[PDB]
Amino acid sequence: SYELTQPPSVSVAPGQTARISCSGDNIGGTFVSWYQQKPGQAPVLVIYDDNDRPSGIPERFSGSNSGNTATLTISGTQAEDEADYYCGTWDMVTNNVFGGGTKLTVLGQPKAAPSVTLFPPSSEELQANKATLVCLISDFYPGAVTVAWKADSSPVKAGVETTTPSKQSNNKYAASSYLSLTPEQWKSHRSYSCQVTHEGSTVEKTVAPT
Amino acid sequence: VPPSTALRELIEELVNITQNQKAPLCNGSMVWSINLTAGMYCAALESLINVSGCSAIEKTQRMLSGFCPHKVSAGQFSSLHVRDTKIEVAQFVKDLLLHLKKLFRE
Amino acid sequence: QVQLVESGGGLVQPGGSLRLSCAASGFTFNSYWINWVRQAPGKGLEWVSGIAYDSSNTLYADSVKGRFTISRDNSKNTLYLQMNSLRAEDTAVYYCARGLGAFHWDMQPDYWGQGTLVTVSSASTKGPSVFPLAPSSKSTSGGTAALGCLVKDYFPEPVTVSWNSGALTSGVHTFPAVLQSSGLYSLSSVVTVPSSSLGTQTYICNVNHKPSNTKVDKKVEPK
């Protein structure tokens, strides 16, 4: 029935101002709230009653509501303002409605090297007739990484499970890869390595058994 | 709101393959639908990423790649299409186009 | 400090039934309309239900009507949601979020709980096995070391992990889960700690899988 629509993405250079639109028929006729939601967190309110900002929220946040569009304006656009942003209202018929939400990104974050940490099968796990190698990759940007595993400098294709990277609290990315092995396989070889490629550079941590 | 240069390039390409393609698109390949939402581009990218037999979509995929901030890998087996439904690529493309088209209807 | 805490999420069979509940604190629970609002992984926000301050009014989303039942007890300061005939597209994080006023015409949320993850599928709840990722100094700064816990083979999401009952908080990195071919989850939690304190300081990860009602306190020792 009544639905509010937002463009699903917006980019700004840092410091320079940012504008998020929420549209719907006679939107000026109601009160618009704006919510900020960062990856893996619940949404926080930043604007209510079209233009009121609750205690806490920096002054650079602002919103207007006019006929058919509501706009959340962020002047002095900062890194930590990167997020998904939602408009929300109340409609007699359909009640609490929310816009599609919009994914804000501050432009030109500098390239960031990954932090690879590789763990070997625990003694418990081996004792349990299972084996998993654990290849944890933190703090990189852009959010793009190729992981590959080698068994005695020979590629291991099977038994790999690797995540698609996810935005860290610090606006860099984290991913992890896990290799499943039979305790035979693990004890059999000299060593195993996961190797992470992030934009031309590669980090290859290696690990071996007792 | 004026057009992002990289964006209208995508709108054009979408238009082409929807308009120009003779037979069905990717021949009875059925993908996951999307909504005018948030991870929309990635969502789209992920949804396409899976069809392998089809060349018509590869440019579109690339195009979309620039829009998604992180790496999308094919066959990320998950229950994340809980709200979405399976549709013909032809129709998928068109929807995307309209949604993108609509962003510029003032 | 305004606080709304939901619980009761888990794996529920299609056509099954589940009761969520939300426990307010830090404000006059009596004076507020409270909503239940959900969010599917990836998807945006959808308002499900809301209830008046005195319970004179109850209101539901069309997609949810006649299947769900919202309620409250102003004495225990708790809101409830009774969900039935659960379709798969009912899967979401379920937030309990407070209105602005006391009546439907002010139901707009301000404060949102942390949410609880209902997972409607015809799979089977499976608990995790925790293993100690023994400390290595290899990849970490001078004088500090990295030790972890692998949380293998559980379903459905989520998993609470903390270290030393919450006492140790900084250094902790609890990575996002991996969806395996098996269609099971696995995560890793890594804490970074003084190299010297190994052999004195006891390190313990407290794993929690509220879905399966399972808890593990794995002690992580040097190799």
Domains in chain A, start-ordered, CATH in brackets? 1-108 (2.60.40.10), 109-209 (2.60.40.10)
Instruction: Provide the CB-side half-sphere exposure for C119 (13 A, CA).
Output: 19
Residue A176: φ, ψ to 5°:
-145, 145
Q: Is C102 exposed, middle or buried (0-12, 13-18, 19+ CB in 10 A)?
A: middle
Token duo for residue A149 = 């595993």
Q: Is there a single domain that holds both residue C189 and residue C202?
A: yes
- Using the Cβ of C178 and the Cβ atoms of chain B, whether some distance falls under 8 Å is answered with no
Q: Does B76 touch chain A (CB under 8 A)?
A: yes
Closest CA to A125 of C218, C20, C160: C218
* CATH code for the domain in which residue C146 is found: 2.60.40.10
3-state secondary structure of B91: helix
* Residues 6+ positions from C4 with CB-CB distance below 8 Å: C22, C23, C24, C25, C34, C96, C97, C98, C111, C112, C113
- CATH number at B6 reads 1.20.1250.10
Within 13 Å and on the Cβ side, how many CA atoms surround A157?
A: 0
Q: Are C100 and C84 part of one and the same domain?
A: yes
State phi, psi for C91 to the nearest 5 degrees: -65, 125
**Residues for chain A: how many in total?**
210
CA–CA gap between residue B42 and residue B55 (Å, rounded)? 19
Name which of A86, A103, A122 to mutate to probe chain C: the one with the most chain C Cβ atoms within 10 A of its Cβ. A122
Task: Give the separation between CA B80 and CA A119, rounded to whole angstroms.
Answer: 29
C91 with B82: Cβ contact below 8 A: yes
Distance CA A81, CA A20 (A): 13
Does the distance separating the beta carbons of A145 and B38 come in below 8 Å? Answer: no
Q: How many domains does chain C have?
A: 2
Query: How many CB atoms are located within 10 Å of the residue A44 CB?
Result: 17
Q: What is the dihedral of CA A3, A45, B71, B74, to 10 degrees?
A: -50
Q: How does strand C18-25 pair with strand C46-51?
A: unpaired
CA B61 – CA B65 distance, rounded (Å):
6
Between strands C68-73 and C78-83, the pairing is: antiparallel
Asked if residue C7 and residue C106 are part of one domain, the reply reads: yes
Residues C53 and C129 in one domain: no
Tokens 């006059």, residue located: C28
DSSP secondary structure letters along C92-107: EEEEEEE-SSSSGGG-
Q: Using CB atoms, which residue from C88, C179, C181 is nearest to B82?
A: C88
Tokens of C193: 């700690």
The closest of A117, A120, A116 to A201, measured between CA atoms, is A116
Write out residues 50-79 of C within 8 Å (CB-CB) of B: none
CA–CA separation, C187 and A166 (whole Å): 13
Across the interface, do A96 and C148 touch by the CB < 8 Å criterion? no
Per-residue tokens: A140? 């990189």
- The answer to whether A61 and A74 have CB atoms below 8 angstroms apart is yes
What are C95's strand-pairing partners? Answer: C37
How many beta carbons lie within 10 A of that of residue A150, not counting itself?
A: 16
Residue of chain C nearest A117, judged by CA positions: C139
Say if the Cβ atoms of B38 and A105 lie within 8 Å: no
C42 vs B contacts (CB less than 8 Å)? 37-39, 43, 80
Instruction: With both helix axes pointing from N to C terminus, report the angle between B40-49 and B58-67 in degrees, rounded to the nearest 10.
Output: 150
Place of tokens 């089977």: C124
Q: CA torsion sign, C27 to C33 to C34 to C40?
A: negative
Q: Are A183 and A192 within 8 A, CB to CB?
A: no
CA A55 and chain centroid, separation: 27
CB contact under 8 A, A161 and C181: yes
Domain boundary among C87, C122, C157: C122
Give the resolution in Å. 3.2
Phi and psi at B65, nearest 5°, equal -60, -40
> Cα(first)–Cα(last) distance of chain B, in Å?
8
Q: In whole angstroms, what separates CA A31 from the centre of its chain? A: 30
Of C63, C10, C71, C3, give the one whose Cα is nearest residue C36: C71
State the method.
X-ray
Tokens of A183: 């305790």
Sign of the torsion formed by the C-alpha atoms of B29, B30, B32 and B36 = positive
The three-state secondary structure class of C215 is strand
**Residue C156 preceded by cis peptide, ω within 30:** yes
Please enumerate in sequence order all residues whose Cβ is within 8 A of that of A135, keeping only pairs 6 or more positions apart, or say none.
A116, A117, A118, A119, A147, A149, A176, A177, A178, A179, A194, A196, A205
C132 and C94 belong to one structural domain: no
Q: Facing residues of A115 across strands?
A: A138
For residue C37, the chain A residues in CB contact (below 8 A) are 96
Joined tokens for residue A41: 């967190």
**Virtual CA dihedral for C175, C180, C186, C187, nearest 10 degrees?**
-10
DSSP structure string for A62-124: EEEEETTEEEEEESS--GGG-EEEEEEEEETTTEEEE---EEEEES----B--EEEEE---HH
Q: What pairs with residue B35 in β-bridges?
A: none
Domain extent for C76: 1-122
> Cβ–Cβ of B71/A8 closer than 8 Å?
no
Nearest to B38 by CA among A86, A48, A107, C91: A86
Nearest to C89 among B39, B76, B83 (CB): B83
Task: Quickly tell me which residue has 């590629």 as its tokens.
Answer: A155
- Gyration radius of chain B's alpha carbons: 13
Check: CB of residue C6 under 8 Å from CB of residue C18.
no
**Phi, psi angle pair for C72, to nearest 5°:** -145, 155
**Block residue for tokens 């009640």:** A95
Which chain B residues are closer than 8 Å to C119 by Cβ?
Answer: 79
Sign of CA dihedral C140, C144, C145, C149: negative
- Contact between A189 and A140 (Cβ < 8 Å): no
Q: Which residues of A touch B67 (CB under 8 A)?
A: 9
Please answer yes or no on whether B103 and A166 come within 8 Å at the CB atom.
no
CB-CB under 8 Å, C183 with B82: no
The residue assigned the tokens 């998807």 is C43
Residues C129 and C114 in one domain: no
Q: Are A43 and C112 in contact (CB under 8 A)?
A: yes
Beta strand residue intervals within C109-182, DSSP E? 116-120, 129-136, 144-154, 160-163, 173-174, 178-179
Domain total in chain B = 1
The answer to whether residues C2 and C79 belong to one domain is yes
What's the number of CA atoms in the CB half-sphere (13 Å) around residue B57?
A: 27
Final residue in a domain of this structure, among C104, C122, C140: C122
Which residues have a Cβ under 8 Å from the Cβ of A199 and sit 6 or more positions away? Answer: A111, A142, A144
Amino acid (1-letter code) at residue A51: N
CA of C99 vs chain A CAs: smallest distance (Å): 10
Mark which of C82, C105, C122 sits at the end of a domain: C122
Q: Which 3 state secondary structure label does DSSP give A188?
A: helix
Instruction: Look up the domain containing B75 and give its range.
Output: 1-106
Residue A85 backbone dihedrals phi, psi, to 5 degrees = -125, 135
Biggest alpha carbon distance in chain A? Answer: 72
Residue matched to tokens 């589940």: C18
Count of B–C CB contacts within 8 Å? 30
For A97-116, b/e burial (b = at least 16 CB within 10 A) is bbbbbbbbbbeeeeebebbb
